[PDB]
Each structure stands twice: as structure tokens, then as C-alpha cells.
């Protein structure tokens, strides 16, 4: 199995050829666990720069058949450079492990913040939505669709700003295929899971959860949650204001082509009235 | 870009580890011109084994941004071994070019055969559909979906056997993603572009085009073709027999889950009444 990715492996001087090596880092406390390894607080020794080192075990990746998914994740995320996207500085590997050198997000996940506060006020919510829409606008400039936006995948920077993480499901979506529609089924012509509008739906779900403290299609079985999503069946508690309802309802369209542009989110009158950014 | 693919580059003794080299091949006449380089008739020098060598220029692949598509195509196709799938024996590369070592299909494309004969009789049609269904059944057993089946991508071996070619749009489609449906849009839960049923629709279009000489949703604009596909709007000429109509109508279903399994195609009584296979 080849661990040669189109992603950087060069040593970086964080006080501003030689490839990364594990001995470049001091390791600190584990930050979390995954199915394939762990994430550690770490520090590059020459600069003393704090970062996160994600360690994945090759045997576990290859047994689960997810090694090409990791390769794509690293290749996509390492070429994104935006203040609301978690940086992937580079990667390296040894006989047993793959290492991802990540930006450290010191304030945790939005998931944990929702556990602590139950729900967010309108200003905190609208500020988060602006940051996310800015990040997703940049992603679309690079023809990247994230496709797995959810509170556990939103980390928090030193200023409390959002950091989109987990590009394990993302795709770069920029032809003889479409030159001829005659043999393509409707789902190949429409390409809905390859549509940037995928991420606009999750933006609506998140705006709802931030304000309400529960996601709009929540149900006690997966099948009922799918029915509610498929039928776009959701309602608002009384306290949700008219502007928030308008934004969320505009985002949660079954047909991806009916969802709004990111500019229309960034300029929505409820966003501009409550966002500090 | 990295040309280290998860695909074989080992020299093969064809008449029954050293890596391929350009000097292993006597390059004969061109077989065709592609977007990024030509395909040549060639023989491996030690064995005199006759094959096709596709030469692609790295500068052109990288300029066009299609090099990860080539990587995926090579990795997928080089691990498929079936008599009705065009073999990709291996690849190699030098400073300027990538080389694909391919099975030579001497008898051209089904697309050309259809141009020459205008339409096929029911025996040839059922035989071809049998071979395609066998090849696609094998693909799906490897969790590979082809997604670009059409007459131009069906080559003919020396006994007239179909060889499925062009895996440039295929996906290997075997999580935390589905662990939480609450944040996913309908199109991400359904995953229709990653459903093996994609290829069953194309098989129905092919069965119709083989018998009729034109595909069922043909229209002189792209928008009208899409509209007819979307509504599954098509008609049968009087000469298409009821048995063929039954099979084609079962395959051409908007809802992919309503399309039959490949075993049902192979076992359809019109197929077995007419196939020589
Ligand atoms: N750069 C980081 N900074 C701070 N905390 C992090 C960072 N990366 C991950 N974490 C935390 O560490 C835990 C482990 O994260 P992680 O395993 O990457 O989740 P994941 O995206 O599902 N990875 P995976 O196991 O491959 O599915 C998570 O719960 C995060 O909250
Ligand atoms: N193994 C083969 N045996 C015989 N003929 C072949 C073979 N591979 C390709 N050809 C023919 O040669 C022509 C050029 O090949 P092809 O690889 O399909 O070009 P292409 O589709 O533009 N490649 P690409 O650059 O990836 O888009 C086609 O019309 C094929 O029919
Ligand atoms: S092929 C017609 C074309 N559709 C796409 O480009 C579609 O999004 C897509 C994307 C990726 C793949 C791949 F993964 F490569 F297989 C396949 C298909 C198109 O013209 N889309 C626009 C459109 C608009 C309205 C209705 C239908 N199509
Ligand atoms: S995520 C829910 C899950 N759906 C799938 O597995 C779907 O086929 C799929 C496949 C691949 C992707 C990926 F490419 F990774 F994005 C995404 C989705 C599921 O629950 N499927 C069963 C189901 C339930 C209800 C309706 C339809 N299907
Ligand atoms: Mg690999
Ligand atoms: Mg991962
Ligand atoms: Mg590459
Ligand atoms: Mg190619």
C-alpha cells in the first residue's frame, strides 16, 4: 500500500529537502480517540510551536479498507488555507503509522459547547454561521465540498472562532461523461451528492441546532429521522424569531438546486443584524 | 504530482521484483489518439506478447487537473480480472509520461459495429447483455460501479467478446458519516451516485439501443434529453418484441431500488431464449 500522497511532507519553520520525522515533535496529552488511532497535543521542537498530531495505524486503515479515503482527506485538507478551516500542515509515515500534523484548536468542539450551554443566543449563532459560510465560500472557490458538517466537526480557535475539521468525506468537484447524456441514469446527470449545495443544507440544520439545542429532524429511530429529512418535516419552538425561521426554511430545501447561494446567507438580514463579523 | 499508485508495476512473464521499463516494449502502429496521448499496438520483447500501450504526458494531465482521476482509474481497473473486462496489466512512468499496459481488443468498438449494422438482432443483443451483466456482476462483487457504460466503451475481443473499458468514472463503493443522519441532506443519506443500480439503468439503455439503433431518450438538445430521462419518457418501435420490452422497461426505472438485480437480467426468459451464452 502506497503512502505517497499529493500533500506536503516537508519540515516547516513555524517561527515565521528536510522531511518531517517523529523526533521533530514533543508529544503531550491525548486529545481524543478514533477507530484508527489517537490525536495528541504536540510541539515542534525547534520552534516550540503547539499543534496536534493525529496518529493512525496502517494495519487498521488497510483492514477497514479506508486508506484511499485517508489519502483523499489529507490531499484535500492540506491545500486549504482559511482562518475558519483547521490547517493540515503536512503528513508523514513510518513502518506502522501515518501522522497528520494539524492546527491545534484550543477551545474544543461546538458539540461540547452545546452540551455545556444547551443552546446559543442569536448573536453567537449568527456569528458562527457567518464564519461557516465564509469557510464554505472559500471551499467552493477551490471546488471542494465538505459533506460532513456537524457540531462534532466544528472546532474552536483561540478567539472562539469556528474551525471546520474532518475532510474524510469531502470531494473535489470541478468531459466525455456529460458529452453524452443518453446512457446516464437520472442520478448521474443530477449528481446531487457532488453538488456544492450539499453543504448549504447542513448549514441550515446547524443554525437550527444552535438556536434550539436539538437538531430539527431528531427522532428515536434512524428510519423515522430519514422520513422526516426526506419529507422536510420540522417545526420551530415559539422563541425562534422570524428572521431565523426565514433563513433556516430557505436552507432546508429537499431539491439542492432550490437552496440559496452562500452570498445570500452572508447577506441575510437576520445574519447581518446579529453577527459580529 | 505523485505517480506512486496502488497498482502493479511488476514485470510480467506473459508466456506462463523487476519493474516495467519502456525498453520492455516494441512500439508498433498507433491504435488511436486520446486527449492526453496515444494508444499504440505493442509487444513485450521477451514474450512477444501483443498488447496495447497507452502513453500519457504528465505535463498535460497535471495542466488539466485530471491526474487523480487517472490514478483512480488505474488502481480500480488493474485489480479487475474478468474475460469481459479489458485487462489493465500494470502501469509505469518516467520523467515525462505515464504508461498503461492494456489488453489489446482487436475488433474495434460496439459503437462502430452499430454504425455498420444499424441495429443488432435479438440473438446478438441478448448475448451482449449476458456478457455485460456477467462483467458488471463481477465488478459489483468487488464493490466497483462503472458509471460510464455506453457503446464507445465496449471493445471487442478477437472472438467477438465484449470488453468493458474506460474506468475513468468508476468508484469503489463499499461509518461516522451515517452514524448521525441528523445533519445529512437527503442526497447524502441516499447516496444514489454510489449505488450499484447506476449500472443497471445503462444496461437497459444499451439493450434498447442494440435493438433499435438509437437510444431511447435521444433528442436534439441536451435539455430535452434530460427532460425525457427525468420523466422516463420513451416509446418502443413496433418491431421490438414484447419479451425485450419487458426487460428494458424493468431496467429503466427512475427509482434505482426498483431496478432489478443483475441475476434477474441473466435469468430473464427473453435473455435465455435468445443468448448464445
Ligand atoms: N486539531 C485538533 N485540535 C484539537 N482537538 C482536536 C484536534 N483534532 C482532533 N481533536 C479532538 O480529538 C478527538 C479525536 O478526533 P478525531 O479522531 O480526528 O475525530 P474524527 O474526525 O472522527 N477522526 P477519525 O477517528 O479518523 O474518524 C476529537 O473528538 C476532537 O475533538
Ligand atoms: N486496449 C485497447 N485495445 C484496442 N483499442 C484500444 C485500446 N485502448 C484504446 N483503444 C482505442 O484507441 C482509441 C483511443 O483510446 P482511449 O484511451 O479511449 O482515448 P481516450 O478515451 O481519449 N483516453 P483519455 O486520454 O483517458 O481520455 C479509442 O477510440 C479506443 O477505441
Ligand atoms: S453529466 C451532466 C452534468 N452533471 C454533472 O456534472 C454531475 O454533477 C456530475 C458530477 C460528477 C460526476 C462524476 F462524479 F464524475 F461521475 C457525475 C455527474 C450536468 O449538466 N449537470 C447540470 C444539470 C442541471 C440540471 C439537471 C441536470 N444536470
Ligand atoms: S449515510 C446513511 C446510509 N447511506 C449510505 O450508505 C449511502 O449508500 C451512501 C453511500 C456512500 C456515501 C458517501 F459516498 F460516503 F458519501 C454516502 C451515502 C444508509 O442509511 N443507507 C440505507 C438507507 C436508509 C434509508 C434510505 C436509503 N438508504
Ligand atoms: Mg495509498
Ligand atoms: Mg481519518
Ligand atoms: Mg497523484
Ligand atoms: Mg485515461
Swiss-Prot record, chains A, B:
Q: What is the effect of changing residue 47 to R?
A: In a colorectal adenocarcinoma sample; somatic mutation; reduces interaction with TPX2
State which Enzyme Commission number(s) the record gives. 2.7.11.1
- What residues does ATP bind to? 35, 54, 103-105, 152-153, 166
Q: Which reaction does it catalyse?
A: L-seryl-[protein] + ATP = O-phospho-L-seryl-[protein] + ADP + H(+); L-threonyl-[protein] + ATP = O-phospho-L-threonyl-[protein] + ADP + H(+)
> Where expressed (tissues)?
Highly expressed in testis and weakly in skeletal muscle, thymus and spleen. Also highly expressed in colon, ovarian, prostate, neuroblastoma, breast and cervical cancer cell lines.
Changing residue 176 to A has the effect of: Reduces cilia disassembly and kinase activity
**What regulates this protein's activity?**
Activation of CDK1, appears to be an upstream event of AURKA activation. Phosphatase inhibitor-2 (PPP1R2) and TPX2 act also as activators. Inactivated by the G2 checkpoint. Inhibited by GADD45A and p53/TP53, and through dephosphorylation by protein phosphatase type 1 (PP1). MLN8054 is also a potent and selective inhibitor. Activated during the early phase of cilia disassembly in the presence of CIMAP3. Inhibited by the small molecule inhibitor VX-680.
Modified sites of kind Phosphothreonine: 175-176
Chain positions covered by the region annotation Activation segment: 172-181
Compartmental location: Cytoplasm, Cytoskeleton, Microtubule organizing center, Centrosome; Cytoplasm, Cytoskeleton, Spindle pole; Cytoplasm, Cytoskeleton, Microtubule organizing center, Centrosome, Centriole; Cell projection, Neuron projection
Active site annotation, chain numbering:
148 (proton acceptor)
Q: Copy out the induction comment.
A: Expression is cell-cycle regulated, low in G1/S, accumulates during G2/M, and decreases rapidly after.
Mutation effect (residue 90 to N): Reduces interaction with TPX2. Reduces kinase activity tenfold. Promotes interaction with the AURKB binding partners INCENP and BIRC5 that are normally not bound by AURKA
CC annotations in GO = axon hillock; basolateral plasma membrane; centriole; centrosome; chromosome passenger complex; ciliary basal body; cytosol; germinal vesicle
Assembly, in brief, is: Part of a complex composed of NEDD9, AURKA and CTTN; within the complex NEDD9 acts as a scaffold protein and is required for complex formation. Identified in a complex with AUNIP and NIN. Interacts with FBXL7. Interacts with CPEB1, JTB, TACC1, TPX2, PPP2CA, as well as with the protein phosphatase type 1 (PP1) isoforms PPP1CA, PPP1CB and PPP1CC. Also interacts with its substrates ARHGEF2, BORA, KIF2A, PARD3, and p53/TP53. Interaction with BORA promotes phosphorylation of PLK1. Interacts with CIMAP3. Interacts with GADD45A, competing with its oligomerization.
Similarity-based family: Belongs to the protein kinase superfamily. Ser/Thr protein kinase family. Aurora subfamily.
Which purpose does this protein serve, as stated in its record?
Mitotic serine/threonine kinase that contributes to the regulation of cell cycle progression. Associates with the centrosome and the spindle microtubules during mitosis and plays a critical role in various mitotic events including the establishment of mitotic spindle, centrosome duplication, centrosome separation as well as maturation, chromosomal alignment, spindle assembly checkpoint, and cytokinesis. Required for normal spindle positioning during mitosis and for the localization of NUMA1 and DCTN1 to the cell cortex during metaphase. Required for initial activation of CDK1 at centrosomes.
Protein name from the UniProt record:
Aurora kinase A
Organism in which the protein naturally occurs: Homo sapiens (Human)
Fragment boundaries within the full protein?
116 to 389 of 403
Amino acid at each position: 500500500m502506497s503512502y505517497s500522497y499529493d500533500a506536503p511532507s516537508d519540515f516547516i519553520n513555524f517561527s515565521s529537502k528536510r522531511q518531517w520525522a517523529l523526533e521533530d515533535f514533543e508529544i503531550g496529552r491525548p486529545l481524543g480517540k478514533g477507530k484508527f488511532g489517537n490525536v495528541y497535543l504536540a510541539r515542534e521542537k525547534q520552534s516550540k510551536f503547539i499543534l496536534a498530531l493525529k496518529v493512525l495505524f496502517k494495519a487498521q486503515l488497510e483492514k477497514a479498507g479506508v486508506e484511499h479515503q485517508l489519502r483523499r482527506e489529507v490531499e484535500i485538507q492540506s491545500h486549504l488555507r482559511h482562518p475558519n478551516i483547521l490547517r493540515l500542515y503536512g503528513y508523514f509515515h513510518d513502518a506502522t503509522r501515518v501522522y497528520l500534523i494539524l492546527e491545534y484548536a484550543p477551545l474544543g468542539t461546538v458539540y461540547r459547547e452545546l452540551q455545556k450551554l444547551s443552546k446559543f443566543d442569536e448573536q453567537r449563532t449568527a456569528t458562527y454561521i457567518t464564519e461557516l459560510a465564509n469557510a464554505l465560500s472559500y471551499c467552493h472557490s477551490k471546488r471542494v465540498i465538505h459533506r460532513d458538517i456537524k457540531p462534532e466537526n466544528l472546532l474552536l480557535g483561540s478567539a472562539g472562532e469556528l474551525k471546520i475539521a474532518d475532510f474524510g468525506w469531502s470531494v473535489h468537484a470541478p468531459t466525455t461523461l456529460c458529452g453524452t447524456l443518453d446512457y446516464l441514469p437520472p442520478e448521474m446527470i443530477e449528481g446531487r451528492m457532488h453538488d456544492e449545495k450539499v453543504d448549504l443544507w447542513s448549514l441550515g440544520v446547524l443554525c437550527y441546532e444552535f438556536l434550539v439545542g436539538k437538531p430539527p429532524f431528531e427522532a428515536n429511530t434512524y428510519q423515522e429521522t430519514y422520513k422526516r429529512i426526506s419529507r422536510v418535516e420540522f417545526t420551530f419552538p415559539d422563541f425562534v424569531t422570524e428572521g431565523a425561521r426565514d433563513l433556516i426554511s430557505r436552507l432546508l430545501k429537499h431539491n439542492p438546486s432550490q437552496r440559496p447561494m452562500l452570498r445570500e446567507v452572508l447577506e441575510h438580514p437576520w445574519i447581518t443584524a446579529n453577527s459580529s463579523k
